[PDB]
A paper describes a structure:
To make the flavin-containing monooxygenase (FMO) Methylophaga aminisulfidivorans trimethylamine monooxygenase (mFMO) more suitable for industrial application, we engineered it using the Protein Repair One-Stop Shop (PROSS) algorithm. The melting temperature (Tm) of native mFMO was measured to be 46.2°C, which is in line with the previously reported Tm of 46.7°C. All mFMO variants demonstrated increased temperature stability compared to that of the wild-type enzyme, as reflected by their Tm values, which ranged from 50.9°C for mFMO_28 to 55.2°C for mFMO_20. To understand the structural basis for the increased thermostability of mFMO_20, we crystallized it with the cofactors FAD and NADPH. The crystals were indexed in the C2221 space group and contained the biological dimer within the asymmetric unit, with one FAD and one NADP+ molecule bound per catalytic site. Interestingly, half of the mFMO_20 mutations are located in a 46-amino-acid subsequence (M353Q to L398K) of a region in the large domain containing three helices: α6 (K345 to T361), α7 (A365D to M382), and α8 (I390 to N406). Structural analysis revealed that five of these mutated residues form new salt bridges involving six native residues (K358R-D374, L360E-R356, A365D-K401, N378D-K300-D351, and L398K-E366), four of which form interhelical interactions, thus confirming the PROSS model predictions. Helices α6 and α7 are directly connected by K358R-D374 and indirectly connected, via the β18-β19 loop, by N378D-K300-D351. Helices α7 and α8 are connected by A365D-K401 and L398K-E366. Two new hydrogen bonds involving side chains are also introduced, one forming an intrahelical bond (α6; M353Q-R356) and the other an interhelical bond (α7-α8; T370D-N394). The lower B-factors observed near the entrance to the active site in our crystallographic analysis are consistent with the increased thermal and kinetic stability of this design.
Numbering used by the authors:
A (entry chain B): 2 to 445
B (entry chain A): 1 to 448
Write the structure that this text describes.
Amino acid sequence: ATRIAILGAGPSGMAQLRAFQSAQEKGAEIPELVCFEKQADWGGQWNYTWRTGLDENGEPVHSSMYRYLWSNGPKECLEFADYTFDEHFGKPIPSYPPREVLWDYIKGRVEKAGVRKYIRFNTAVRHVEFNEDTQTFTVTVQDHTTDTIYSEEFDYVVCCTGHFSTPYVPEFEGFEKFGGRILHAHDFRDALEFKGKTVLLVGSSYSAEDIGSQCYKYGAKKVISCYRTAPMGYDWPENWDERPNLVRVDGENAYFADGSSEKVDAIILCTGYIHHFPFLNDDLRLVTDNRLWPPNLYKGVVWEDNPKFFYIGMQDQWYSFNMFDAQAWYARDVIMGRIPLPSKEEMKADSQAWREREETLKTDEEMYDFQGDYIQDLIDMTDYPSFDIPAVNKTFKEWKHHKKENIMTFRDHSYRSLMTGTMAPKHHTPWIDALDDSLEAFLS
Amino acid sequence: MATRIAILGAGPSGMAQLRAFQSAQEKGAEIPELVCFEKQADWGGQWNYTWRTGLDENGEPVHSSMYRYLWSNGPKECLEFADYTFDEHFGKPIPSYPPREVLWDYIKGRVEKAGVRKYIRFNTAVRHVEFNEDTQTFTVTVQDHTTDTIYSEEFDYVVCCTGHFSTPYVPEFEGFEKFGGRILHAHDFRDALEFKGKTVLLVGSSYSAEDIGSQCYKYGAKKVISCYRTAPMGYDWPENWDERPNLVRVDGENAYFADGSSEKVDAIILCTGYIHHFPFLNDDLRLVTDNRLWPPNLYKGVVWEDNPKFFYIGMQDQWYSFNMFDAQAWYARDVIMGRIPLPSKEEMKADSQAWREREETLKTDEEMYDFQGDYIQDLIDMTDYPSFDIPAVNKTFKEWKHHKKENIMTFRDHSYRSLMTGTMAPKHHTPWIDALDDSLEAFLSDKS
Ligand SMILES: Cc1cc2nc3c(=O)[nH]c(=O)nc-3n(C[C@H](O)[C@H](O)[C@H](O)COP(=O)(O)OP(=O)(O)OC[C@H]3O[C@@H](n4cnc5c(N)ncnc54)[C@H](O)[C@@H]3O)c2cc1C
Ligand SMILES: Cc1cc2nc3c(=O)[nH]c(=O)nc-3n(C[C@H](O)[C@H](O)[C@H](O)COP(=O)(O)OP(=O)(O)OC[C@H]3O[C@@H](n4cnc5c(N)ncnc54)[C@H](O)[C@@H]3O)c2cc1C
Ligand SMILES: NC(=O)c1ccc[n+]([C@@H]2O[C@H](COP(=O)([O-])OP(=O)(O)OC[C@H]3O[C@@H](n4cnc5c(N)ncnc54)[C@H](OP(=O)(O)O)[C@@H]3O)[C@@H](O)[C@H]2O)c1
Ligand SMILES: NC(=O)c1ccc[n+]([C@@H]2O[C@H](COP(=O)([O-])OP(=O)(O)OC[C@H]3O[C@@H](n4cnc5c(N)ncnc54)[C@H](OP(=O)(O)O)[C@@H]3O)[C@@H](O)[C@H]2O)c1
Ligand SMILES: [Cl-]
Ligand SMILES: [Cl-]
């Protein structure tokens, strides 16, 4: 029979397994599935580790998530259309859950599906090669439980390895002289390490916003964020300064493009990530900056030069979980021969139309509107449950409004489920005072 | 020549392998085409310092484990090249325990003189090495991070020089997920100043624990705790350094030891050693071993017995370092060039097994560096690598061990004689404990 390799058991790989299991329970014959995951358990980013740098096997540490992390968007925007918050939790819960609560949710769906049996944990993907002679892929992996490098042949491969794990880590003048810690956002674990300290954040996006907010919340003496082009422009607290870009450091001080300088204890590079696929040769390897429309992907998923190779979740994310579902359902239907692909020329013409639109986008609203339209096109082609994308866009609009009103209280707001219409209750504690990140403390 | 060699890495071992070939060429031999792949932007391996930790600018694991303020942990006289002396490089006597930048300068000096930088492709990560039975050649696949290109080339021989002190052994202890302080491996340690006024727990009882603890002490840590798995280090530690039996668990703030004691600690540094990790090799070529004086499956400690066109340099545990890699690289060179015909697989395994049986009996430090000295003597007797006085190096290791026992904080204040030139090292202008500036300029200057 047909054999599929699914690379990774984060949200995307979980979605890909669930997509196949959904087709099976509706009565379809599905291919043999094998999912390779280098971590010891599923959940991808959402599987928290104290580890940084390299794991116990020598593999790069995957997760970038830290203690005290909460949902940075409304949970109502990432709800599964086939497995609601109401089904999983059995009651209304607040709109910005801590990491452990969303990890519990995503695991709940695949626990229900029974798809853990397809997953080989502690197994790092080493190489994927396409064989023209057999029209099959050789997937080579390292099983760290047995310390064995082995290969198997697959008919199709679905890459679900994420793109927020391999850091973009630029050097600044004087880093070799600096007496304090220099780390990337990827390595950040515990805001308590920076209690009573002066922390410099290099960058102006989600990691700078939230790591700065955690350092503030857990008692940093001072936060400095520095921007390359434009300030973040939010209402920062009194002990948070925004500066133009870092120019250089010395033993103790950071020097900014405005000619100012001051003592800093630690530097956190919130400079984003690279798309990194060392297990792919250039015939299969996606090369892209982080963007809403990466190139060479028909419907954002099908590798145009070899359409038996698929990528899930490689777009920049406003939508996250239910985008990966729409993609996984699409990829499943292509694999199962339910969606015949057009010619390479027709695929490229379709992708180019989406690219041309992506190139014009300016505002946050234009961006989540584009991604909503993309997902609508995907769900129109499969049996993934329809959901109210314009209502989700309106929720993103409210969220963006709440961040502008007050960047420290946006998580104190509640939104309505677009799947069930359930209104989220207000949490028992305002975010700034909610020090305990535990599922037990949140659901109490 | 019509054959081509891939050398994986441009640390001391890969530099030695290039120098071995260049030495044969300047003496009038025809040598093979050489290609050396190095993922860093410059040569030196461990000795090339970086502020970076975890993953580098290209997403490759950061290689170097070296830190600010690192000095030679053995006498430089024990690692001197037999073909390129300290006297030749520096033009004067220098003290016996140079800072990192000074030994980096030295190792670079030899390959600068040799002109072998032209063979090296920097910023290039080795991804895969496969042996092809059909052509009896290796396909080496690499990622050139300068151009972001993955390409493959065919090689007749491969010499693996990628080290084994870079991929950390990082065991989890009960409660690590709860602990509110930093947890890092020795591999990630960069700057003792980060621990000034802090209580630092070191897990481990070998060189990394000794030296990282010594740096934390020197640069003003409040307290050092070192914990041992089997036996204490047993040195004369300063008053703010405690030795405990092994860590059992941690909570939010405290470390709990096997003696039933516990105390609040600010940071935990795992000084738990390293793993031999070769993700670019399939199991037919991949060395699997613990850190030891005699890793298995290596004839003369260098020739992969299942495929003797594949070689490993420097994969042994190290008393000897630079001149061991030279002895090995000269041997591998002579096998590649057909100067040393190999015995049958059965004869190679019988020779390796004799060395293994001896290795298994070793107990004392002296038995260990004596074994490694005898190993190196066997290698150098088979090639034109300049003979050097191995018993005199062993005697220097013995003096060094004696100096560490007398006073672990002042062993670096002693001087030894070059076994290559007979030059006596002068006393440094500053005692180690007060020598806060690690720069080559500060070390080679005359002012204290
Ligand atoms: C710090 C951080 C916070 C975030 N917070 C939110 C949030 O609040 N809300 C939200 O909607 N989204 C958030 N995201 C976005 C995040 O990308 C998605 O939520 C989701 O985790 C992406 O799922 P994925 O499966 O595509 O990738 P990942 O979650 O990265 O999972 C990829 C999986 O592939 C495995 N893998 C990778 N390489 C290999 C290999 N070679 N061999 C084997 N296995 C491999 C990994 O170990 C991992 O399990 C956050 C991202 C980051 C980095
Ligand atoms: C912290 C520390 C301190 C030390 N101090 C001393 C000392 O004072 N005295 C002493 O004698 N010895 C010391 N050593 C021992 C050390 O092993 C040797 O000095 C020497 O650096 C070993 O050289 P090598 O070339 O075998 O390996 P390395 O120095 O580790 O060099 C390996 C090279 O391979 C490259 N490489 C690795 N993987 C790849 C890949 N996939 N693709 C491409 N290139 C790759 C690396 O980037 C590097 O250039 C120390 C070791 C450590 C870890
Ligand atoms: N749940 C949470 O609270 C949380 C926390 C952290 C991250 N995340 C998630 O993680 C993902 C990644 O977010 P991210 O902000 O890490 O990455 P990102 O969105 O790709 O942000 C990249 C940032 O790096 C900056 N940058 C790049 N090079 C720079 C340089 N040389 N100097 C200064 N700044 C530089 C960019 O500035 P320019 O704009 O000038 O290019 C930009 O601000 C997102 O999905 C996010 O939601 C979530
Ligand atoms: N120039 C310098 O100053 C400097 C500094 C750092 C390192 N180095 C070099 O780096 C190399 C490696 O030295 P290293 O000490 O890092 O590694 P190493 O010699 O392999 O030592 C490993 C240590 O980890 C301990 N260990 C392993 N697992 C443990 C566990 N679960 N709990 C507690 N302890 C555990 C071992 O204890 P057991 O003995 O009980 O097994 C041993 O003490 C050497 O070449 C060294 O010279 C040099
Ligand atoms: Cl069907
Ligand atoms: Cl000012």
